[PDB]
Amino acid sequence: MGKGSSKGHTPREAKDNLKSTQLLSVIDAISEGPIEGPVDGLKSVLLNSTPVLDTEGNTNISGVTVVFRAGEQEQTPPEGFESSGSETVLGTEVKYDTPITRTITSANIDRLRFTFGVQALVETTSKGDRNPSEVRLLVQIQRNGGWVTEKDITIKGKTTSQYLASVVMGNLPPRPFNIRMRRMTPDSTTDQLQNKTLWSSYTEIIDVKQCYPNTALVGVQVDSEQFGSQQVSRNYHLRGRILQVPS
Amino acid sequence: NGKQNTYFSSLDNMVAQGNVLPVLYGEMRVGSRVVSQEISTADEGDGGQVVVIGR
Amino acid sequence: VPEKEAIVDNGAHFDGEQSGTVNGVTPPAVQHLTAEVTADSGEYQVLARWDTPKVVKGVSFLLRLTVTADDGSERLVSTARTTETTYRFTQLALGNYRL
Amino acid sequence: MQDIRQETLNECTRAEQSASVVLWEIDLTEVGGERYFFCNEQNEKGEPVTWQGRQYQPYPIQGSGFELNGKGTSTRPTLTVSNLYGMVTGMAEDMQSLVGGTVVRRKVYARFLDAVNFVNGNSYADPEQEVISRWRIEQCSELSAVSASFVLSTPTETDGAVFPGRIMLANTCTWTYRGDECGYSGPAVADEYDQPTSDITKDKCSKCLSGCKFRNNVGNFGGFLSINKLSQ
Numbered sequence A: 001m002g003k004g005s006s007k008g009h010t011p012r013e014a015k016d017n018l019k020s021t022q023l024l025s026v027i028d029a030i031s032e033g034p035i036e037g038p039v040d041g042l043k044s045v046l047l048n049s050t051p052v053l054d055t056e057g058n059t060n061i062s063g064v065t066v067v068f069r070a071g072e073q074e075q076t077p078p079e080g081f082e083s084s085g086s087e088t089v090l091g092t093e094v095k096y097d098t099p100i101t102r103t104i105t106s107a108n109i110d111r112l113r114f115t116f117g118v119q120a121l122v123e124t125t126s127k128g129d130r131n132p133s134e135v136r137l138l139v140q141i142q143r144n145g146g147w148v149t150e151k152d153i154t155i156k157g158k159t160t161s162q163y164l165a166s167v168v169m170g171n172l173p174p175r176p177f178n179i180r181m182r183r184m185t186p187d188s189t190t191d192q193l194q195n196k197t198l199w200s201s202y203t204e205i206i207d208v209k210q211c212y213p214n215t216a217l218v219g220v221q222v223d224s225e226q227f228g229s230q231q232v233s234r235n236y237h238l239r240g241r242i243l244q245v246p247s
Numbered sequence B: 001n002g003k004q005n006t007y008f009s010s011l012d013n014m015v016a017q018g019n020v021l022p023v024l025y026g027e028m029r030v031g032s033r034v035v036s037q038e039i040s041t042a043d044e045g046d047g048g049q050v051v052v053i054g055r
Numbered sequence C: 001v002p003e004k005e006a007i008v009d010n011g012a013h014f015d016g017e018q019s020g021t022v023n024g025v026t027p028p029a030v031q032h033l034t035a036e037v038t039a040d041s042g043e044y045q046v047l048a049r050w051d052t053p054k055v056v057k058g059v060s061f062l063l064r065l066t067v068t069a070d071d072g073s074e075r076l077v078s079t080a081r082t083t084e085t086t087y088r089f090t091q092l093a094l095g096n097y098r099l
Numbered sequence D: 001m002q003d004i005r006q007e008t009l010n011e012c013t014r015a016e017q018s019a020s021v022v023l024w025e026i027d028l029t030e031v032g033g034e035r036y037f038f039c040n041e042q043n044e045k046g047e048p049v050t051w052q053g054r055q056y057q058p059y060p061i062q063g064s065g066f067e068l069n070g071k072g073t074s075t076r077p078t079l080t081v082s083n084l085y086g087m088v089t090g091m092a093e094d095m096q097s098l099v100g101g102t103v104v105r106r107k108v109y110a111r112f113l114d115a116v117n118f119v120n121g122n123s124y125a126d127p128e129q130e131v132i133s134r135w136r137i138e139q140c141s142e143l144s145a146v147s148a149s150f151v152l153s154t155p156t157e158t159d160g161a162v163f164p165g166r167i168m169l170a171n172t173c174t175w176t177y178r179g180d181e182c183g184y185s186g187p188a189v190a191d192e193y194d195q196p197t198s199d200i201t202k203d204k205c206s207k208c209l210s211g212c213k214f215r216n217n218v219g220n221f222g223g224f225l226s227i228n229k230l231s232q
């Protein structure tokens, strides 16, 4: 699936009832200089002792984001890995009428993380038997003048107290920036429908700048929930160096 | 216990400080020298536009 | 060659942060700790949820649940060590619980 | 079987053979010196020996320990030269005791030498007839008021070398400044103490992270700025 770069990306299973997902982000160091790469592909990434992709092509493990880097001198840093972040809290209600906007206008940003959420999602009825509310929110970028919708999120759950999520975008244009988040569900007209939303904070991420010039890194970024409390023993069935072999 | 090790294989993720990178010559299944390891909270969504937190 | 001496005690320009990166891989405080007292199952239960911060090489969590006494003091009710990001408490008597 | 011409093998098998002269050359160009040509003997006209158009000056010099062997230590020859009148001394105080220089040794039958060296001329002169060997100077073992002695070594000599060589480090760069791996080509910025300078002769990297940042080369930093905490 490539030479000198790779993406992997077997998909993650959609959740059932909210919950957070712990992530395990590692970067390994193998070989020196240009190398051939994996023998097969995602079938040569043994997360603990099993390949991510079954020999028939099925996915053994869900949530794998291998990004292979050869040892070529001209490389790029592994995308998706953070080195430092700065979080600004603006926890306020988001209504249909009034969006927020903050005009980050930062200097050395690389990716933007939004921390939205719902105060409570219950929908009370006669007696009891509360039900989910299924709210929808929208995250939009400045994008010159056109308020392009970067993300549109639907939240479906019952809950009783505050629940917060997070979402990351990149490819940020120059920075006279103006980010925004707005609501789609009209409002909580009746006291029996509690579907208030909130925008707690946003984070500026600087990411990894060091494109390790002559090593073979791999990087995984696998959700560690499926594995237990024991460590994950990454193994790689790779090929070796590219030699200066006689013509 | 009785395991026999060689000088040309490693299936373990070794510490990567003052330890030389390594050298691999063709094929083989290899361990690594861990450069980074970070357990954190993932952020919902993969790509595109449509994201649903829970179903 | 005595003139060697003056060259030795001229160590290079180390970057800084002699305090030890002001973190010492000490895990940051866990964020978004929410406790939910629910009774839809027929009895009072408490579901606690939180989010793991960015912590090196792995993480576990220590939970300490106490109850405020009548005089304002605290009574150590329970302790736990877990790896999941959710916990559930049952059979809790009335009181003001600090988790 | 050494690539040596047929005339040399013809001369080797003769019962009565000509004298076998050895001509030495010391090459210090790679270390900062010149090339000196020496022969232990003059010719019949009392002049430095002319071989292939080059004059090898008369000077007492001879070597020993020359052999071709694979089992055991790499062979270390030894070259003894005269230090009367303080010639080698002058080179020892000048060229870091000649360490790192190249010693080239040629074996030539006197029958094949240039016609200049002989009063009656040499109709058999053949400047292609020679056996060449190369060595390096490892240590000037002795240097007295009388003579000097040098230890020679094969140019390979994997004695102090290690493999693999590149080492994982934090807060330090293992690249060579302005080298291919470093990839830097910008103007003078700072010296090894991170002091801002515009002088090209005082422009060296401190090998720390700040030194890399001074040149906007952090992407090419040779260190690994995460490993200090995983080794705890």
Ligand code: SF4
Binding pocket: D173, D174, D175, D176, D177, D178, D181, D182, D183, D184, D205, D206, D207, D208, D211, D212, D215, D217, D218, D220, D221, D222
């Ligand atoms: S720190 Fe940066 S500029 Fe200095 S030698 Fe290393 S790669 Fe080059």
